Design a protein around this ligand. Structure first.
Ligand SMILES: COc1ccc(N2CCN(c3cccc(C)c3)CC2)nn1
Ligand SMILES: COc1ccc(N2CCN(c3cccc(C)c3)CC2)nn1
Lengths: 40, 273, 236, 255, 273, 59, 59, 57, 40, 40
């Protein structure tokens, strides 16, 4: 129950439960498959 | 969810453990690519590492102090701590600062909590009960000059009155000019040859003004204000390397000269355990 | 008027509680969000990116050189480097992994340790990396080392080797601050055959080493880092 | 017979071929794109010179020697004088751009050495003076020359200490930023595609640089016996999807 | 439910009262196996003997004390009780301890309650109003040194601020490394020849830090902290023999030498009533 | 603002009361339970196991 | 009696909060509204009317 | 809501920027009547300028 | 939920969301069209 | 009604109403019937 009118006044947000490290761990242009050779 | 699957002997032409790090990727290698594993489940979600959780607890961001005393003959209230402002910022104290600067841009609502306690360092008959007023003087508003200016009428400016010993609490929406708060800024406010460098030229959210509403009693009373800040509804972009050297200034990246080696030297060889 | 009773804890301020508050700026409209590449949601997302380990810690002031593990041509049987696995201390401590682990009290999971070789292309080498699970001493010679988790690495076209320290543990969580009961083992590396340089070439070659966490990893019970402190408030 | 290894990038009227690549990085897995209306604020129609600005400019070459500490360029600064890109830059009030960065360094199978090529969004530098000394404008706008981390401290300039990234963080952790290594034994180029990253939809191109490109030797250069002890490093950069807005009189900037 | 059924005379070949205790069983013999009984009902459920109930009331687990006084010239705040930590544990006080050690492994959430009262043993004009801060410094965190360290910013560490005379209350999830808390441990932290023995080597939950936020008044004020602990959501495994001798140490089973006979000697014969 | 009245007993701490409290460690995930033989639920379960009586108390 | 807990901020007066209050004049009937030309609803309505600029500020 | 619509070159007999202020009106002229604009949205409602808000603290 | 009986005791009103500047910006008797000549 | 998000913050648990002394009172491998001879 929100007792207040504005959105800033609500409690903390709830877990992204998004999670996708590939923008950070695999930003390569041509896809790399694990197990296939790195450099062909 | 499985944390590890079962995997047995391998004799392949398909080697997942040989890679080329020059590419910039961190290939997702697992225990089961190089030893024989058994199934195990995660039993865990990663709840407490969510950025909302990481930045979402109150941190002390500022400690100031004001006193209640006879202003009779004081030529500069501000200077007597009759009242005191706080050119608002979060770079002041280092604990929360290192946490925020793990990101480049951050966006979130703030929920401030203000604790005020009183001290009577010299002979008093009693402890008086003082009411503090905290008024947010955004940029472009009249700035107090005396501890009981017309300013403090604060007819258009949000102000909270609470008692010393108590706590005041109120949150404010994300009041950034941009889409997010910059944690860093490699720019200037204009192409001037001598204008400052860095964030400072963006941090312009005004200042918070504190004062006691009470007139003076016979003794003097020191009131020390602690502002706590909790981020709610957090959004963070672009992770960066953590801060290694100590901080020297609000808003610049500068570290102190003749600082000490930050990497612990081995007591022994490279070969040592 | 509805009858109430207040409980113990009334009026307390717990920095970790999460409740509603009045907005000081009623009706204010925040700036629209625009799109920015790079959003982070979990610290678990970022500790999977690998970063360099200053393994060569033996210097006396921080230098680019403590990131370089040297290799000697023609040595046989000998040991390249050694370290315990207290990820919250020692070599690990300044790495991004080490640096984040320090915001939490407990960790569990597998680690990924990789070595990228930088010697001339016409050289060759075979190294063995060994993980020694808790309970034995840091190995003292390859024979000892080779009886635990190990990978023979053959230096080739493929420049990096990724070793995983699989989670070997009785207790399901360990402390990030070094603790005995909770200790994780040792990591050592030895010549399997030996580094060989081509003609017209000389000196030391170096390995770069990285550390990142497997998707396996769990961190819990947040706390304050020993990695940052201060004596007076900063000012502008 | 496609290898990760050979590549061709054609952009405008200019083409680059590498026969010894190591894939390419696209920052944060996003490719440069123009500014959508839903994200727009300034009401001005923007100008998109296209092929006259989105081509490859090769900056002047550097020389890697055994004593090198590393070099640093800022964008869009490094290009402030390249052809029509630069003119547009000084003539509009606001502009926006992504880039393709191609760093080149070839040697032989007897050399060793490894450079880190990294892009840092919002790289705010530190003053070597400490305290709250600022870093003057000119110092953070080196132009095509870039900053040479093995040059001496100057007054009003930034600190040039490599183990600290010019800001109080450790060299070892720069790997959290989009980056690629050039390891003579593997690699001979590094290519990074940079999408536009800012907290505003479009900004000023002269008062704010939005990325620093940094090339840092990490495993020292080691040449074969009686070889000359140095290699040149060349940086070629191409603006991509550039848009300029708020045209007028032509900015005058310090120094 | 019947507590006793009706049963009459018996002249059988089936004797439920003869058993062999050497087997390790306690055969479930009832009044009706050996006398003639009448029906009666239980009227009772055994509600208040549930382990949740048994371990579920608050028990005092710790009393400490800190003082508010001028720290000017104090070389060791910790030592002046300017502030005080509590290497957290439940073995300290014996009442709750004997109750828990009826079990080998125990698992439960804790709901702590902290009462703080002030004393002014020597001449004061008044009673000041102090705010206590209690901050949980888990293992691996900076440890206060002074009563107003950067530590106390406690940007990532949960802390509660309440007033002396009041009470603070907050529960914490079960933060054991294992699946349950060991009440006993017949092991070491490693196979060392001189490393400690027992539980102590597991009890490593950090310590609780207390301090007054107020600066000093003219008099001195003693604040004494009492921590109460209530188990909620209890789970207990493997019952053991109750503690007979007195306790000597947190975490070891050791009893004092030349202790006294714990079994009451008869005043009379074996035959005595 | 809803009108309230507080009753006698407000603010007291009764060691035997059972109410909710804020968690100091929001979002923390406890270690999984594994199976352990021997769980006790009621003290009534254990007082049915017989134990020896020092009947010969005369020492 | 329903159990409650009061949070930080209890008793504060924030000049910008918006809550209900008891009416001091229970049951009073205000004067009827009549029609008046000119009602303003937003300050945004009025800043669109142009006004003169003292551009020649040099006096 | 659009804050500005897209508008291009103009060569008309219909001039929205010439008016007669003597009339007492403020003619509703927009950026797009005199320069070439691109679409942009308002993203804003004017909530905090309502007179209830202005006099309500 | 109003806890009180009188209307004066309720909280602040809610946004007009009325907005019509023409009574102030265009109070002319004969309508003026933008683009058509001001004075004919 | 839980007012709080985390499970640790809820009140005491509710009676096992489990109760099975046989793991403690009769852990014998071959079942013993009351009335039948203990040792056959
Ligand atoms: C560097 O990042 C940030 C992040 C948040 C922030 N602000 C400071 C001002 N603050 C604020 C805004 C409105 C009213 C009051 C009292 C304080 C909001 C948070 N400042 N810098
Ligand atoms: C011997 O059994 C136990 C049972 C519980 C227990 N702990 C002590 C630490 N405690 C704790 C945990 C987190 C935060 C705070 C303040 C205290 C939880 C209970 N310690 N030992």
């Amino acid at each position: 129950i929100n007792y207040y009118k504005d959105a800033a006044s609500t409690s903390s947000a709830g877990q992204s439960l998004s999670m996708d490290p590939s923008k950070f761990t695999e930003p390569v242009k041509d896809l790399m498959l694990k197990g296939a050779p790195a450099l062909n | 969810t499985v944390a590890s699957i079962s995997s047995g002997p391998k004799h392949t032409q398909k080697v997942p453990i040989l890679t080329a790090n020059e590419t910039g990727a961190t290939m997702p290698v697992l225990p089961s690519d190089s030893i024989e594993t058994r199934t195990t489940y995660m039993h865990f979600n990663g709840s407490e590492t969510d950025v909302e959780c990481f930045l979402g607890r109150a941190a002390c961001v500022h400690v100031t102090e004001i006193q209640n005393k006879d202003a009779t003959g004081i030529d500069n209230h501000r200077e007597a701590k009759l009242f005191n402002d706080w050119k608002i910022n979060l770079s002041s104290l280092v604990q929360l600062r290192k946490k925020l600067e793990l990101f480049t841009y951050v966006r979130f609502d703030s929920e401030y909590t203000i604790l005020a306690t009183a001290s009577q360092p010299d002979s008093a008959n009693y402890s008086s009960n003082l009411v503090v007023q905290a008024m947010y003087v955004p940029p472009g508003a009249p700035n107090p000059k005396e501890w009981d200016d017309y300013t403090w009428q604060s007819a258009s400016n949000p102000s909270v009155f609470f008692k010393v010993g108590d706590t005041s609490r109120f949150s404010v929406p994300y009041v950034g000019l941009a889409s997010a708060y910059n944690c860093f800024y490699d720019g200037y406010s204009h192409d001037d040859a001598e204008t400052q460098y860095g964030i400072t030229v963006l941090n312009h959210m005004g200042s918070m003004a504190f004062r006691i509403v009470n007139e003076h009693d016979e003794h003097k009373t020191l009131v020390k204000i602690r502002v706590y800040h909790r981020a709610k509804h957090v959004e963070a972009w672009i992770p960066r390397a953590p801060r290694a050297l100590p901080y020297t200034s609000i808003g610049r990246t500068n570290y102190p000269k003749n600082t000490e080696p930050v990497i612990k030297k081995r007591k022994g060889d490279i070969k040592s355990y | 008027g509805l009858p109430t009773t207040t409980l113990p804890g009334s009026g307390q301020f717990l920095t970790t509680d999460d409740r509603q508050s009045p907005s000081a700026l009623p009706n204010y409209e925040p700036t629209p969000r625009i799109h920015i590449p790079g959003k982070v949601h979990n610290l678990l997302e970022i500790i999977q990116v690998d970063t360099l380990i200053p393994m060569n810690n033996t210097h006396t002031k921080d230098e680019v050189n403590s990131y370089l593990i040297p290799l000697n041509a023609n040595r046989q049987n000998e040991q390249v480097f050694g370290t315990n696995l207290f990820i919250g201390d020692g070599v690990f401590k300044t790495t991004l992994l080490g640096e984040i682990v320090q915001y939490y009290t407990h960790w569990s999971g597998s680690l990924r340790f990789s070595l990228m070789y930088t010697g001339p292309a016409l050289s060759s080498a075979k190294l063995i990396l060994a993980y020694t699970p808790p309970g034995a001493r840091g190995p003292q010679d390859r024979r000892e080392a080779m009886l635990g988790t190990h990978v023979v690495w053959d230096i080739g076209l493929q420049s990096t080797i990724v070793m995983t320290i699989p989670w070997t543990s009785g207790v399901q969580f360990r402390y990030t601050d070094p603790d005995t009961y909770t200790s994780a083992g040792f990591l050592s590396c030895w010549y399997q055959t030996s580094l060989i340089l081509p003609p017209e070439t000389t000196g030391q070659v170096y390995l770069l080493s990285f550390i990142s966490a497997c998707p396996d990893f769990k961190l819990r019970l947040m706390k304050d880092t020993q990695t940052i402190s201060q004596t007076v408030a900063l000012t502008e | 017979g496609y290898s990760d290894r050979v590549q061709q990038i054609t952009l405008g009227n200019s083409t680059i071929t590498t026969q010894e690549a190591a894939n390419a990085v696209v920052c944060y897995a996003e490719w440069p794109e123009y500014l959508p209306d839903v994200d727009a604020s300034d009401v001005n129609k923007t100008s998109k010179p296209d092929t006259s600005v989105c081509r490859f400019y090769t900056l002047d070459s550097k020389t890697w020697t055994t004593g090198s500490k590393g070099w640093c360029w800022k964008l869009p600064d490094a290009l402030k004088d390249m052809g029509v890109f630069g003119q547009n830059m000084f003539f509009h009030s606001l502009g926006r751009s992504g880039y393709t960065v191609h760093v080149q360094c070839n040697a032989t199978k007897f050399h060793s050495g490894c450079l880190l090529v990294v892009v840092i969004p919002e790289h705010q530098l530190a003053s070597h003076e400490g305290g709250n000394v600022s870093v003057k404008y000119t110092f953070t706008h080196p132009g095509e020359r870039g900053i040479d981390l093995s040059s001496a401290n100057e007054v009003g300039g930034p600190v040039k200490d490599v183990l600290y990234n010019m800001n109080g963080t450790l060299l070892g952790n720069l790997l959290i930023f989009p980056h690629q290594f050039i390891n003579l034994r593997t690699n001979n180029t590094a290519t990074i595609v940079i999408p536009y990253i800012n907290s505003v939809p479009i900004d000023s191109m002269t008062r704010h640089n939005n990325v620093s490109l940094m090339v840092i030797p990490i495993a020292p250069l080691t040449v074969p016996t009686g070889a000359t002890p140095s290699l040149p490093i060349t940086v070629t950069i191409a603006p991509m999807c550039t848009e300029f807005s708020g045209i007028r009189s032509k900015s005058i900037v310090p120094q």
